[PDB]
Every structure is written in C-alpha cells, then in structure tokens.
C-alpha cells in the first residue's frame, strides 16, 4: 500500500 515513511 502507499506509505509516507517511518514514524519510530
């Protein structure tokens, strides 16, 4: 799926 990067 689309993603918008890591969040930790």
């Amino acid at each position, epitope marked *: *799926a*689309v*993603g*918008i*990067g*890591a*969040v*930790f």
Partner: antibody
Amino acid sequence: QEVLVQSGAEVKKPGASVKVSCRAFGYTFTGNALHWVRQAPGQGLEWLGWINPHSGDTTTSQKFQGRVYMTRDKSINTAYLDVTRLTSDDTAIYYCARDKYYGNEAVGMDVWGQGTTVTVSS
Amino acid sequence: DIQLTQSPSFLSASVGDRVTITCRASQGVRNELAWYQQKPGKAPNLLIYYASTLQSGVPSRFSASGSGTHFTLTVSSLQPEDFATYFCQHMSSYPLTFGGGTKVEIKR
C-alpha cells in the same frame, strides 16, 4: 481514549484562505499518518492528502497540489490544513483521520475528527 | 485515479436480513481496501481493512471478502443500528479514492 478534535466552523469569501486544525489526544501523535478528507453536502468522500507527523512529509492529491498545504506542530500534537484560493466548490465538511498505519503503510482510517464546516461564498 | 463502483447504491431491508454490497475497482488494488459505515451528521467509522480483517469494536455480523477488482461486504442478521451508508476505499496508489456509497434503509 484516542480522539482527534478539530477547530470550529469557518466562513470565507472566494479567493481567501482557511486553516483548519486537528489536535490528537490519547495516543502518540507522531506514531500514525494523518489524512485529510472532505465531504460536500449530499456527496461522498474526497481525499485531500496525508501527512507523516513525525517527519512532516506529505502527499497531496493532484487536484489540490499547489493550493492545499499540510503541516504539524509536535509541541501541541496538532496538524493543520491550509486551503488557499478558495471557491464555492470548497464548501464542505473537512475531516482529519488517523491511519492505523501498520507497517508504515496505509491500512484504514480508524479515528476521525468531528469535522469542520467550511462555507465559501460571495 | 481508481474508480470504485458500489452496487446497489440504495437498498431497503428488514431487521434480521442479510445484505451483500459489492465494490468493483477499475484496476486491481490487491487487498488494499477498507470499508466504512457513516450515519447522518457523523464521521465514518472503519469496519474492515486489508479487504477482510474486521476492525476491533465491530460486531461479527460484519464480514468481507475479495481481492483484485471485486470486493464484497456482507452484513448478516441486520440490526436497527446498521441502517446507514457504507463506503469502500482503496489505498493501493495515489490518490486514495472512495466508492460512491450504498445507503441501507429500513422497510415498512
């Protein structure tokens, strides 16, 4: 529990801008992507974009690029939606909505703000 | 943009009935599909994600299936609180898009 609280109703003239806010409570704000979706009266749901509150990175739907801007302020757990160059076609209820974001991908919108009504008219 | 077409758009049903709602996607979206309920004056609530996983807090009379371009939400043993509008949504590419909705109203 986990909730999103939005700012109050807005009324604007064509060509103006509006900034809607959305504050997260009960969970780590920067742990989940946040979407912005609108719904005009009697109509369906339209996705504007989303933001990673940790990094600030965003994706904006093609039709809103260069007109809608998403930001956040981690010190108050708040995301903002700025919609510029408004026209009456922007009259709608605007929602922020958290994504479950398992695996750092879109999965589904599980916590929604109460919505903010924006009316644009001459 | 991916177009999600729901059918039927409007349905009348009685308490205890089973309702089957279809979502067809204009191109394949794998399992990257969610379903929502919306009642008048309220934000939508998430029912299903990953095409067939039930969201916590949703009764087991909701179930869903499908992949690719054909998805189905089934609400068995319809209860009074289930009369609402239902929407599908994909997240397989940008922009995210939603189906047009299916409104389920009560027969009398």
